Amino acid sequence: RHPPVVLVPGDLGNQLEAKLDKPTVVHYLCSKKTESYFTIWLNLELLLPVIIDCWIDNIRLVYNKTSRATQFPDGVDVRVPGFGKTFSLEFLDPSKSSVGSYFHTMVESLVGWGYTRGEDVRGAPYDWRRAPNENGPYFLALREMIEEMYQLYGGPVVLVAHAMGNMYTLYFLQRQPQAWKDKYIRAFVSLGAPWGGVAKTLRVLASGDNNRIPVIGPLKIREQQRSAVSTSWLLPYNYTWSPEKVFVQTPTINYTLRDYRKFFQDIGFEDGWLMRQDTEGLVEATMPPGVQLHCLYGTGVPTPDSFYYESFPDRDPKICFGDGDGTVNLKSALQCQAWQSRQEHQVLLQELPGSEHIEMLANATTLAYLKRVLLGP
Ligand SMILES: *[C@@H]1O[C@H](CO)[C@@H](O)[C@H](O)[C@H]1NC(C)=O
Ligand SMILES: *[C@@H]1O[C@H](CO)[C@@H](O)[C@H](O)[C@H]1NC(C)=O
Ligand SMILES: *[C@@H]1O[C@H](CO)[C@@H](O)[C@H](O)[C@H]1NC(C)=O
Ligand SMILES: *[C@@H]1O[C@H](CO)[C@@H](O)[C@H](O)[C@H]1NC(C)=O
Fold first, then answer.
1. CA distance 166 to 195
2. Which residue has the least CA distance to atom 14 on ligand 3?
């Protein structure tokens, strides 16, 4: 009898749905109203050039300087479907196209080992545009789901998290009493955790990143990417990187992680600084989760490290690459080492050489490791 499993996805890592009754639109071809919720991520037909402005106008967040919190635009609601199920993390596109295949391979493996979707394997999707401080209801639901699974399946749960989901999970665990964790959590499997931030966030905020949707212009998509609090939350931290490391070079000025205030001024996005101040303290840099932890990190994949702009910030930069999994810098991934001596439960590090950030979820070596955690040797 295997332990129950909860899957926690990363940024862009689950479906999102929206419903509209807007006072105004950015152009005539945008819908003001929808009769039902529709899939806003991932739905390829919404990301065509004509209609991308409509999508941006609906999926952007509004930052309120007074409340220091985000809001949806007027007349837009966004929901997270499939909480407690797996469909919305298995496939990002409900057409089930391979372009959106995310947790599917892993869930198929779990089911082959005797798990049942929605029962002893459940997903914990969330609004990944936000940081954990504005996802309180999610954490309550997660705690309840874990307790339910413990009761139903007769033992403590294994959390398996990918990318930013790891930081969501750490935030959650840092806030639960040790006695609760000792009873209800069997282990935490961390895949590709950006503990110390990722360097590519600088380029995203400055000049946009359209690599996920290449037919769209980077300056257009930048509007949405800046609006997501999670982007500013994952700027490089000084517990991983040197305060003297230059992340952005231009012909006249450098930006290090001690220069974020100037950076946000200079790219014309002052709200980003406020978001960073709101979020930089959320995850305690050094406090370990207090559960058995398996830290899996990819290496040997060129990963954005720093950027040179000939023209700043409205032209794409030249990119300098360092080590990591293609998205998460190796330095960020390695914050676990420090936790080894700071908690009693074991912290196991596992290098995955040549394993790319998303591919690691469907990789046979990753799955073999998970099998050993769940089923024994
Ligand atoms: C910002 O929040 C304050 C207090 O909650 C509220 O008075 C105001 O309506 C908000 N501003 C916007 C533009 O929604
Ligand atoms: C590390 O980061 C924070 C600022 O957000 C601060 O508490 C601490 O003093 C910093 N240390 C530096 C810049 O050396
Ligand atoms: C910016 O970076 C370069 C090193 O790349 C350094 O010489 C220069 O002094 C830095 N800017 C400031 C204000 O120190
Ligand atoms: C899976 O990960 C291993 C290391 O863990 C890596 O060497 C291998 O190339 C990966 N598989 C694929 C298909 O890339």
1. 8
2. 254
Q: Does ligand 2 lie within 6 Å of residue 302's CB atom?
A: no
In angstroms, the CA 267 to CA 313 distance is: 6
What SS3 state is found at 159?
strand
What's the token pair of residue 347? 């912290």
Name the residue type at position 2.
H
Backbone angles phi, psi at 359, to 5 degrees: -60, -25
Q: How far apart are CA 28 and CA 301, in angstroms?
A: 44
The H-assigned helical ranges of 60-97 are 87-90
Q: What number of other Cβ atoms are within 10 A of residue 57's Cβ?
A: 19
Cβ–ligand 1 distance for 65 under 6 Å, the answer no
Residue 50 CB coordination number (10 Å): 9
268 CB near ligand 2 (under 6 Å): no
360 CA to middle of ligand 1, Å?
A: 42
Nearest-angstrom CA–CA distance, 75 and 31: 12
Token readout for 198 is: 């990722």
Question: Which domains does the chain carry?
Answer: 1-14+81-197+282-301+323-377 (3.40.50.1820), 15-80 (no CATH), 198-281+302-322 (no CATH)
In this structure, the strands spanning 16-20 and 121-123 are unpaired
The answer, yes or no, to whether any atom of ligand 1 lies below 6 A from the CB of 341, is: no
Please, what is the end-to-end C-alpha distance for the chain in angstroms? 14
CB-based burial, 85-111: b 16+ in 10 Å, e otherwise: bbbbbbbbbeeeeeebbbbbbbbebbe
Distance of CA 297 to the CA centre of its chain: 15
